[PDB]
Structures are given as structure tokens and as C-alpha cells.
Design an enzyme around this catalytic site. Structure first.
Site, PDB file in Angstrom:
ATOM      1  N   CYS A  46      -4.848  -3.066   9.145  1.00 42.20           N
ATOM      2  CA  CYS A  46      -3.623  -2.341   9.517  1.00 42.20           C
ATOM      3  C   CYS A  46      -2.574  -3.056   9.389  1.00 42.20           C
ATOM      4  O   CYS A  46      -2.353  -4.207  10.050  1.00 42.20           O
ATOM      5  CB  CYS A  46      -3.570  -1.535  11.060  1.00 42.20           C
ATOM      6  SG  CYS A  46      -2.188  -0.494  11.221  1.00 42.20           S
TER       7      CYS A  46
ATOM      8  N   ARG B 227       0.565  -2.782  13.061  1.00 39.34           N
ATOM      9  CA  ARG B 227       0.078  -3.480  14.323  1.00 39.34           C
ATOM     10  C   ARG B 227       1.083  -3.743  15.248  1.00 39.34           C
ATOM     11  O   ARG B 227       0.957  -4.073  16.435  1.00 39.34           O
ATOM     12  CB  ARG B 227      -0.929  -4.161  14.054  1.00 39.34           C
ATOM     13  CG  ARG B 227      -2.277  -3.592  13.869  1.00 39.34           C
ATOM     14  CD  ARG B 227      -3.373  -4.890  13.602  1.00 39.34           C
ATOM     15  NE  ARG B 227      -3.343  -5.363  12.430  1.00 39.34           N
ATOM     16  CZ  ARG B 227      -3.834  -6.465  11.844  1.00 39.34           C
ATOM     17  NH1 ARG B 227      -4.690  -6.879  12.943  1.00 39.34           N
ATOM     18  NH2 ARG B 227      -3.827  -7.019  10.943  1.00 39.34           N
TER      19      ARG B 227
ATOM     20  N   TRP C 162       2.250   6.825  11.262  1.00 35.93           N
ATOM     21  CA  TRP C 162       2.994   7.531  10.394  1.00 35.93           C
ATOM     22  C   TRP C 162       2.730   6.667   9.030  1.00 35.93           C
ATOM     23  O   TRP C 162       2.546   5.660   8.972  1.00 35.93           O
ATOM     24  CB  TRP C 162       4.707   7.340  10.850  1.00 35.93           C
ATOM     25  CG  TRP C 162       5.099   6.209  11.118  1.00 35.93           C
ATOM     26  CD1 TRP C 162       5.390   4.926  10.387  1.00 35.93           C
ATOM     27  CD2 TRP C 162       5.296   5.539  12.296  1.00 35.93           C
ATOM     28  NE1 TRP C 162       5.733   3.903  10.999  1.00 35.93           N
ATOM     29  CE2 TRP C 162       5.937   4.169  12.246  1.00 35.93           C
ATOM     30  CE3 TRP C 162       5.349   6.325  13.734  1.00 35.93           C
ATOM     31  CZ2 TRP C 162       6.321   3.419  13.170  1.00 35.93           C
ATOM     32  CZ3 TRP C 162       5.755   5.345  14.776  1.00 35.93           C
ATOM     33  CH2 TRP C 162       6.182   4.067  14.588  1.00 35.93           C
TER      34      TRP C 162
ATOM     35  N   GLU D  21       1.803   4.317   0.267  1.00 36.54           N
ATOM     36  CA  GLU D  21       0.388   5.173   0.591  1.00 36.54           C
ATOM     37  C   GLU D  21       0.290   6.446  -0.446  1.00 36.54           C
ATOM     38  O   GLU D  21      -0.817   6.614  -1.025  1.00 36.54           O
ATOM     39  CB  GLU D  21       0.031   5.465   1.957  1.00 36.54           C
ATOM     40  CG  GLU D  21       0.089   4.415   2.957  1.00 36.54           C
ATOM     41  CD  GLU D  21      -0.605   4.736   4.214  1.00 36.54           C
ATOM     42  OE1 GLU D  21      -1.850   5.271   4.113  1.00 36.54           O
ATOM     43  OE2 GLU D  21       0.252   4.784   5.192  1.00 36.54           O
TER      44      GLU D  21
HETATM   45  C1  HEM Z   1       2.297   3.815  13.358  1.00 35.46           C
HETATM   46  C2  HEM Z   1       2.220   3.505  12.042  1.00 35.46           C
HETATM   47  C3  HEM Z   1       1.377   3.063  11.174  1.00 35.46           C
HETATM   48  C4  HEM Z   1       1.307   2.643   9.692  1.00 35.46           C
HETATM   49  C5  HEM Z   1       2.535   2.263   9.063  1.00 35.46           C
HETATM   50  C6  HEM Z   1       0.173   2.249   9.476  1.00 35.46           C
HETATM   51  C7  HEM Z   1      -0.268   1.895   8.275  1.00 35.46           C
HETATM   52  C8  HEM Z   1      -1.423   1.606   7.709  1.00 35.46           C
HETATM   53  C9  HEM Z   1      -1.983   1.495   6.280  1.00 35.46           C
HETATM   54  C10 HEM Z   1      -0.798   1.301   5.034  1.00 35.46           C
HETATM   55  C11 HEM Z   1      -3.141   1.361   6.179  1.00 35.46           C
HETATM   56  C12 HEM Z   1      -4.027   1.223   4.938  1.00 35.46           C
HETATM   57  C13 HEM Z   1      -4.473   2.776   4.646  1.00 35.46           C
HETATM   58  C14 HEM Z   1      -5.202   2.671   3.088  1.00 35.46           C
HETATM   59  O1  HEM Z   1      -4.800   2.003   2.260  1.00 35.46           O
HETATM   60  O2  HEM Z   1      -6.408   3.642   3.193  1.00 35.46           O
HETATM   61  C15 HEM Z   1      -3.742   1.568   7.595  1.00 35.46           C
HETATM   62  C16 HEM Z   1      -4.857   1.321   7.885  1.00 35.46           C
HETATM   63  C17 HEM Z   1      -5.695   1.268   9.198  1.00 35.46           C
HETATM   64  N1  HEM Z   1      -4.804   1.697  10.202  1.00 35.46           N
HETATM   65 FE1  HEM Z   1      -2.701   1.493  10.411  1.00 35.46          FE
HETATM   66  N2  HEM Z   1      -0.863   2.253  10.585  1.00 35.46           N
HETATM   67  C18 HEM Z   1      -0.210   2.730  11.591  1.00 35.46           C
HETATM   68  C19 HEM Z   1      -0.693   3.131  12.750  1.00 35.46           C
HETATM   69  C20 HEM Z   1      -2.092   3.224  13.203  1.00 35.46           C
HETATM   70  C21 HEM Z   1      -2.560   3.279  14.379  1.00 35.46           C
HETATM   71  C22 HEM Z   1      -1.851   4.103  15.507  1.00 35.46           C
HETATM   72  C23 HEM Z   1      -4.004   3.123  14.249  1.00 35.46           C
HETATM   73  C24 HEM Z   1      -5.082   3.101  15.362  1.00 35.46           C
HETATM   74  C25 HEM Z   1      -5.041   3.452  16.630  1.00 35.46           C
HETATM   75  C26 HEM Z   1      -4.078   2.354  13.088  1.00 35.46           C
HETATM   76  C27 HEM Z   1      -5.449   1.850  12.661  1.00 35.46           C
HETATM   77  C28 HEM Z   1      -5.742   1.609  11.447  1.00 35.46           C
HETATM   78  C29 HEM Z   1      -7.018   1.251  10.692  1.00 35.46           C
HETATM   79  C30 HEM Z   1      -8.361   1.117  11.714  1.00 35.46           C
HETATM   80  C31 HEM Z   1      -6.815   1.090   9.422  1.00 35.46           C
HETATM   81  C32 HEM Z   1      -7.810   1.229   8.592  1.00 35.46           C
HETATM   82  C33 HEM Z   1      -8.765   2.147   7.865  1.00 35.46           C
HETATM   83  C34 HEM Z   1      -9.547   2.050   7.055  1.00 35.46           C
HETATM   84  O3  HEM Z   1     -10.400   0.914   7.232  1.00 35.46           O
HETATM   85  O4  HEM Z   1      -9.843   2.736   6.066  1.00 35.46           O
HETATM   86  N3  HEM Z   1      -2.992   2.506  12.155  1.00 35.46           N
HETATM   87  N4  HEM Z   1      -2.849   1.587   8.404  1.00 35.46           N
HETATM   88  C1  LIG Z   2      -3.839   5.377  11.199  1.00 41.65           C
HETATM   89  C2  LIG Z   2      -3.251   5.294   9.920  1.00 41.65           C
HETATM   90  C3  LIG Z   2      -4.157   4.989   8.882  1.00 41.65           C
HETATM   91  C4  LIG Z   2      -3.688   4.958   7.502  1.00 41.65           C
HETATM   92  N1  LIG Z   2      -2.408   5.052   7.210  1.00 41.65           N
HETATM   93  C5  LIG Z   2      -1.507   5.109   8.323  1.00 41.65           C
HETATM   94  N2  LIG Z   2      -0.264   5.026   8.122  1.00 41.65           N
HETATM   95  C6  LIG Z   2      -2.209   5.064   9.659  1.00 41.65           C
END
Ligand code: HEM
Ligand SMILES: Cc1ccnc(N)c1
Ligand code: HEM
Ligand SMILES: C[C@H](O)[C@H](O)[C@@H]1CNc2nc(N)[nH]c(=O)c2N1
Ligand SMILES: C[C@H](O)[C@H](O)[C@@H]1CNc2nc(N)[nH]c(=O)c2N1
Ligand SMILES: Cc1ccnc(N)c1
Lengths: 413, 413
Positions: free
Chosen positions: A110, A113, A282, A287
Site C-alpha cells: 500500500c 499508508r 480513496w 489505478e
Molecule cells: C486512503 C487511501 C489509500 C490509497 C491512495 C491507497 C492506494 C493503494 C494502491 C495504489 C494500491 C495498489 C492497488 C493495485 O494495484 O491493485 C493499494 C493496495 C493495498 N492497499 Fe492501500 N490505499 C489507501 C488506503 C488503504 C487502506 C485504508 C487499507 C487498509 C485498511 C489499505 C490496504 C491495502 C492493501 C492490503 C493493499 C494491497 C491489495 C492487494 O494486495 O491486492 N489501503 N492501496
Molecule cells: C484499500 C485500497 C486498495 C486499492 N487501492 C486503494 N486506493 C485502496
């Protein structure tokens, strides 16, 4: 002692002393077993549970600025007793909240974070029926969507007990478009949701055969068979794609949902497992604009946006692909900004992560990071994240991947 | 048995059975020890040498389409004898050629390995003086440059014997621009060559204090002290940067050398080590346009090219960085094409690698690949390489990194 980490951009050096807390590695494998926490048909053995449980309780009470030693020892004993007598244990709401943020904090893939502390937690541990799951999910979707001003949230369903009574969402994401295998060999909609779309159909869902048909929630409660529920349209907020210069852009009739919500991941904490705990944040421009719209295995709008721009779409060296994708990205960000829907461009996101990573090494000397996932799908080296060396390790609490439910589910009817 | 590899783009699956031949891993570390082959002050122990030697001889003779069993056994015995009596062994020219191409073939970080068989080999194993190295290098530069029609070549200097008589080039690349620490705190030229530039000065080199001053060759022969030689200007072919639309581009006075030649890597083969074996190929757009010109730790021309384009260089979300870098890239490719200098855009390169990787799995069931290095510094997911899962392993022959010579060299005078 520690592992040296260098950022070839600014030159700074970091000492990772946090990886020592890792648990149980192959290049660019997307779904490695080390990142997956599968099914069980028997409870978690006490010899394993008790240590993890104790370990977690120590972390939680070890976070407080003003130590509460008394309560700590108390919780420890009470927890132990509860395990001896019940054969498992329930976390305090305060502990669960701490667990969800830590697990997010420990998500190597992520990039957002930095927000790890800003997360809303919905305690749905007392749930018991599919219809009840559906209600909690809707409340989640409604709270998170917040009329475009997106809020990060997570809904925690009942933890795994024996393994035969698992709460599971069969969807990958809460809101997701359908993918239909058209009559004339061509695919329509989101090609990635092909197999799952079929399943929904097999369960009596009404296929509206369109480019953006929102898939139904396939919920499974207490180990029972999955029940299908259609998400109320009034709940699914979408953004129409418009380019700030190319009026012909909207003529493409593109749009995407404003809510990025992971639905099929497992939350591990203190030896406890939560097979159903959908969470959301968000979106980040790339993405949608890069992966969702441009991937060949998705909507593949690249070659189409090319022609309309008047580019040499037959001469790779012309860098037409680079030019296009950038405008498609401009569209996404623009459309979201205009329609008042929270979103962040990859550049701003990258810096944000650097600030976070930096804050982490100070606060605890480390930050688990999967470089392959952190570096955006466009203009890699242009972002600071590219030049930052990172260590990828699995801490705890953690958010694991799960084996697709329809492959391990033993049907009743 | 084998490891499953999936290409999420086309969906294809591959079975890697080649990684089993690997030898002695941490995320995105640029210089891991596992990829470095350091100095020695004693010969290679026979117990280790003989096995590797035998192993190599088997590979070489095992490549022929029409097996030559007789010669094989013969070479084996002759090789063994030579080791017993001499305490090392000399490769046949034919074997060395085979070794260089295999080592290239086994370079996880190279994206142009489809050319692995098209490589010119210069046998400079009988060299003995610095001046003689300088002559061989010039012949190399002249042959490779070929008036813009770049040719891949490698010059193999005398193998390491005891470790105290190592042939080493102190430069990173044959042709490389100087980096001076200006009076007014600001850097000038290639900031990456700062420390090495100083060294050249310490050795009496004449600093011309300019943006593109070609560094001198710092050669070390038979373990002796390094001697400095200036590369004849008539040999260093350069390309002036021009944009096909922005006439103000050339007003930036940019240019880059057309010869990408690795100078400081070690060639490992059959237990033998070659501390000096500079090799070259031809450039790929993004190398110059993205890394060399846009990296903050290099020429950093991004913010400058931004203003001139009339972009909102103060609003990250405007995606000005994405727009610019693409035009800088257009410039590079254009300037090279116009001036008749071989070059390949990243897109065309990526497909090329996919074809190669595919050919490798058929021919030998595997292809060592460092995803982090293979995916271009811009428009990652736009290229097929991004969606291809890869395994990264160290085979043999191999091209290793070496500890910077000025850190381990025991000076005479
Ligand atoms: C608040 C804004 C957030 C942004 C901008 C963000 C952005 C991202 C992005 C760009 C990815 C990659 C997605 C992909 O390529 O498939 C991702 C993955 C992930 N996010 Fe974040 N995220 C946010 C919040 C969160 C939150 C709130 C959590 C958990 C409580 C979180 C948990 C994860 C996890 C575990 C992954 C991996 C998903 C996977 O392995 O397919 N994210 N996030
Ligand atoms: C939780 C989560 C997963 C993927 N993209 C995001 N922006 C957020
Ligand atoms: C013929 C055209 C070739 C192209 C287009 C090509 C392209 C590339 C590129 C893009 C890189 C990454 C450079 C960087 O980011 O620092 C690279 C690295 C490398 N190339 Fe190739 N290459 C070619 C030929 C060769 C040849 C002929 C050899 C060896 C005989 C070779 C050996 C390597 C090695 C070992 C690396 C890694 C260097 C390092 O680790 O810093 N390449 N090449
Ligand atoms: C930290 C990271 O490994 C580093 O900045 C990278 C990543 N991948 C790369 N890719 C290539 N081709 N060349 C490089 O210099 C790097 N460096
Ligand atoms: C094979 C490779 O791991 C895969 O195609 C990647 C790489 N990095 C990624 N990066 C993100 N953020 N999301 C992804 O889907 C992927 N997939
Ligand atoms: C050998 C080599 C190294 C880097 N870039 C290239 N194009 C070639």
C-alpha cells in the site's frame, strides 16, 4: 543488528531493525503462498494461539504513551483464562481498532499508508446472517462514499472459529464492474471479472450485458451457502470521464466507481483470523487511468484514444502510447476533481509515501515495502519511490490473501 | 520439479526448470553482495576450480548440435592436466566467445538479451601494460561506434591469477561525462561521476570544467598502479539533442554519447575470473531521456524543460512531469534517428525481451530476470514486461559487480 537502506535520490541512509520481527520470497510473483492464509477444518491449536495472543497483547499495551502496567498484566491473565476456558478469545473494540490500523500499516503493497491512523472501524463481529452482512456492507459503502468526500473504513465480520463457519465475501472489491463473454467472441466490460461474473449468473443474477454493470454482492455467512444481493444504485457513486481540452473524450462514454474497497482479504492478529473484513481508501489516479483503462486484459482503451488524438498508432517509436496514457490520466484526475470526488495523483502519492516511510523508520526503525507494487505503473523514476531501496517482510497484524472461496467451498444444496 | 510463471497480460503460463542450476536476496537493493565478486590475495583453490572447470567444459561441448564426443573427453583430460601442472587453465578462443555470450544471456538485468548471439569478442588476454590496454580499448570504441551503426562487442583482458596482478578499469563506463563540484555550491555536469572525477584530477587530469567533459580512462594492468589516458575526441561519437517541434530544445545545448559500454564488471566462467572485460551494446531511449537527463541526482533537466513548455510546474496534479519527460524522450529518439545513430525505444525493447524470454524457456526452460531492472523507468504497465512474472537467479557464466578498485588498491608510489 540492522540492514542498511539507501535512497539513491537524496543519498540518505536508513537502518532497518524492524525486519527482525518477521515471520515465515520469489521475484515478481503476484500470489505467493507466503502472502496467503488459506482455509482450516479444525480450530487453531492452543500451543500456537496462546503465544501469538500474548505477543499481541504486549504490543497493544506497549503502544500507549503513558504506560498502564496494571491493566496490561490484567488483560494478559484475562486473555489467557479466556483461551483456556473458551478455546479462543475476543478482542476489545479498542484492540481491534489498533489491529486494523497496524495491519494496514504493515501492508507492503500500500502506497497510502501515511493515513494509517485515519481509519473508521465498524464492529460487525456479532453478525450472523447474509442479509445482516449485506446491511453492514451498505452502511460501509454509504459511510465511505460520503457524497464524494471519501473516508477510509473497514467492517470486521466474525472471526474464524473452527474453519467450517467462515464469513466470506466472494467479491474481490465491493464495487466492481461485470465482464461478459459476448456472442461474437469479443469481451465486454471488465474482462478481469469474467469468471466471477459467470458465477453470479449461475446464482441467478440478472446479466444486463453492458460496459459498466455493477456486480452483485455474493455473501457467505457462518459457513453457509452464499446469497446474492444487488447493491442499491443510489449507493454506487460514479465519475463520468471528461478531458479538459478534448471534448471528444466524453464521447467515449467512460466512467468508473469512486470507491476502492478490498473485499476478499483476511486480517491476522494475535493468532486470530478474520476471513471477512472489507476495507477501503480513496483512489490514486494511475489505478484507473493506467491499469483499469489501459491494461490489455481490462478495458484496453489505449489504441482507441490514440487514433482520436491523431497519433502514429502504428509506429511504436513515435511514443504515442506514452502521450495517450498521460491524457487518459489527465482525464481521470480532472473528472474526479470536477465532480468533487476525492482522488490523488501518483506523484503527490509517492512523495507522501516517502514522508511516511521516513516517519516509520524514526518511530520504529522500519517499514515493510514491496517496491514492485509501490512504484506507479507510469513515470517510475520520475517519482521518488523508484530510487528508494526497500525491504519487504511480513509482520503482524497483517492482511493476507485468501484462496478463492468457490474453489474450497463444500456446497449444501 | 519446476516453478510456475504467469504472464497476466496474455495469460500464458511457463515452467521454470532452469533455476535449479543456480549457485549461492533482499528486495530492491542495488548492490547486494550476492551480485558482487570481490578481490583475492591467493589463487583459486583446486578443489573448487576443477569442478567448475569440468562443469563448464561439459556445457560448452553440450551446446553443439552435432555432438563431438571425442573432442569433449579430450578437452576434459587436457584441461585437468593443465590445472594440475599450471594451477589454472586458459580457455580456447571458441570457449571464451561462448562464455561471453552465455554470461550476457545470464544477465538478469539486461533487456536486450535477444541479441545474446550477436557479439564481437576481442581477445586481449595477452595484454600486459596500461598503454596496451588503452590501445585495445580504443580499437573497441572504434569498432563498436562504427560511425553510428553501433555494434555489440567485448574486450577480454588477462584473467585473474593470484589476485595481486589484476587488470582493472577504474571507470564505470568507457565513455562517461565528468562531474565538477563548482565554487558556488552547485554541481556541474554528471553529478554521478563526482567522486571518480576527483580521482582523475588527483592523478593529474586536466579538468575542463564543462557540462559534458569526457572523463579519461583510468587503467590498471597486471596489478600495477593506474595510468591515466585521455580518449581521442575523434573516437567519442555524440548526439546533439533536437526536438521535432520545439526549436527551443536545442537552445538547451544538450547532448549525449552514443556508446553504452560497461567497464567495471567481472566475467565469471568455469571457475576463472576476468576482472577487466568491458562490453557494449546500443542505447535504449529511456536510459538517456529518463535516467541520465531527468534523475535529480544527474542532469535534472525536468523542471527546466517544464517551464519552456508552458506547464503548471508548481501543480503536481497537472501531470506536467509526465508530459515533459515524454517530450525529452521524443527528443532523444528523434536526435539519434536523425543523426543516424542506432537506438531503440523502450516499447520496442520490451516486446523484444518478451520474444527472447519466450525463446529461452523453449530452448532451455528458463530465463534469469530482474523485474525491477527490466521494467523501463516510464510507462511500466504500458509495456508487456510489467505483467510478466519472472524468476531472478544467478547462473554461470555470469557478469558480476566488483568492489570499487580505489578502495582496495594498495598503492606503490
Ligand atoms: C486512503 C487511501 C489509500 C490509497 C491512495 C491507497 C492506494 C493503494 C494502491 C495504489 C494500491 C495498489 C492497488 C493495485 O494495484 O491493485 C493499494 C493496495 C493495498 N492497499 Fe492501500 N490505499 C489507501 C488506503 C488503504 C487502506 C485504508 C487499507 C487498509 C485498511 C489499505 C490496504 C491495502 C492493501 C492490503 C493493499 C494491497 C491489495 C492487494 O494486495 O491486492 N489501503 N492501496
Ligand atoms: C484499500 C485500497 C486498495 C486499492 N487501492 C486503494 N486506493 C485502496
Ligand atoms: C545490444 C543492445 C543492448 C541494449 C539495448 C541493452 C540495454 C540495457 C539496459 C536498458 C540496461 C540497464 C542499464 C541501467 O539502467 O543502468 C542494461 C544493463 C546491462 N546490460 Fe544490456 N543492453 C544491450 C547489450 C548488452 C550487452 C552486449 C551485454 C553484455 C555483453 C549487456 C550486459 C548488461 C548487463 C550485465 C547489464 C547490467 C549492468 C548493471 O548491472 O549495472 N547488455 N542493458
Ligand atoms: C532502488 C532501486 O533498485 C533503484 O533505484 C533502481 C531500480 N531499478 C532500476 N532499473 C534500471 N534499469 N536501472 C537502475 O538504475 C535501477 N535502479
Ligand atoms: C508480475 C507483476 O508482479 C505484476 O504484473 C504487477 C507488478 N506490480 C504491480 N503493482 C501494483 N500496484 N499492482 C499490480 O497489479 C501489480 N502487478
Ligand atoms: C551493455 C549495456 C549496458 C547498459 N545499457 C546498454 N544499452 C548496454
Amino acid at each position: 543488528q540492522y540492514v542498511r537502506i539507501k535512497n539513491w535520490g537524496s543519498g540518505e541512509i536508513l537502518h532497518d531493525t524492524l525486519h527482525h520481527k518477521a515471520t515465515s520470497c520469489l521475484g515478481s510473483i503476484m500470489n505467493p503462498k507466503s502472502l496467503t492464509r488459506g482455509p482450516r477444518d479444525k480450530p487453531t491449536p492452543l500451543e500456537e494461539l496462546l503465544p501469538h495472543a500474548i505477543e499481541f497483547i504486549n504490543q497493544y499495551y506497549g503502544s500507549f504513551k503513558e504506560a498502564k502496567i496494571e491493566e496490561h498484566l490484567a488483560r494478559l491473565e484475562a486473555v489467557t483464562k479466556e483461551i483456556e476456558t473458551t478455546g479462543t478469545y475476543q478482542l476489545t473494540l479498542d484492540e481491534l481498532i489498533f489491529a486494523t490500523k497496524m495491519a494496514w500499516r504493515n501492508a507492503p503493497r500500500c502506497i497510502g499508508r501515511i493515513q494509517w491512523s485515519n481509519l473508521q472501524v465498524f464492529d460487525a463481529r456479532n453478525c450472523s446472517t447474509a442479509q445482516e452482512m449485506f446491511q453492514h456492507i451498505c452502511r460501509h459503502i454509504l459511510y465511505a462514499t460520503n457524497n464524494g468526500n471519501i473516508r477510509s473504513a473497514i467492517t470486521v465480520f466474525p472471526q474464524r472459529s473452527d474453519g467450517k463457519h467462515d464469513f466470506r465475501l466472494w467479491n474481490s472489491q465491493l464495487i466492481r464492474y461485470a465482464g461478459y463473454q459476448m456472442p461474437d467472441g469479443t469481451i465486454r466490460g471488465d474482462a478481469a471479472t469474467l469468471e466471477f461474473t459467470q458465477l453470479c449468473i449461475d446464482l441467478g443474477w440478472k446479466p444486463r450485458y453492458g460496459r459498466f454493470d455493477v456486480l452483485p454482492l455474493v455473501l457467505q455467512a457462518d459457513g453457509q451457502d452464499p446469497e446474492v444481493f444487488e447493491i442499491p444504485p443510489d449507493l454506487v457513486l460514479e465519475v463520468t470521464m471528461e478531458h479538459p481540452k478534448y471534448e471528444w473524450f466524453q464521447e467515449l462514454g467512460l466512467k468508473w466507481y469512486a470507491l476502492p474497497a478490498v473485499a476478499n482479504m483476511l486480517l491476522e492478529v494475535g493468532g486470530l483470523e478474520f476471513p471477512a473484513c472489507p476495507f477501503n481508501g480513496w483512489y490514486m489516479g494511475t489505478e484507473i487511468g493506467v491499469r483499469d483503462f489501459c491494461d490489455t486484459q481490462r478495458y484496453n482503451i489505449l489504441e482507441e484514444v490514440g487514433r482520436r488524438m491523431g497519433l502514429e498508432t502504428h509506429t511504436l517509436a513515435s511514443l504515442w502510447k506514452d502521450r495517450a496514457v498521460t491524457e487518459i490520466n489527465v482525464a481521470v484526475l480532472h473528472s474526479f476533481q470536477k465532480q468533487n470526488v476525492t482522488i490523488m495523483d501518483h506523484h503527490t502519492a509517492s512523495e507522501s509515501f516517502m514522508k511516511h516511510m521516513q516517519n516509520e523508520y524514526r518511530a520504529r526503525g522500519g517499514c515493510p515495502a514491496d517496491w514492485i507494487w509501490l512504484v506507479p505503473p507510469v513515470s517510475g523514476s520520475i517519482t521518488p519511490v523508484f530510487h528508494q531501496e526497500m525491504l519487504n517482510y511480513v509482520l503482524s497484524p497483517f492482511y493476507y490473501y485468501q484462496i478463492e472461496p468457490w474453489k474450497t467451498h463444500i456446497w449444501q444444496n
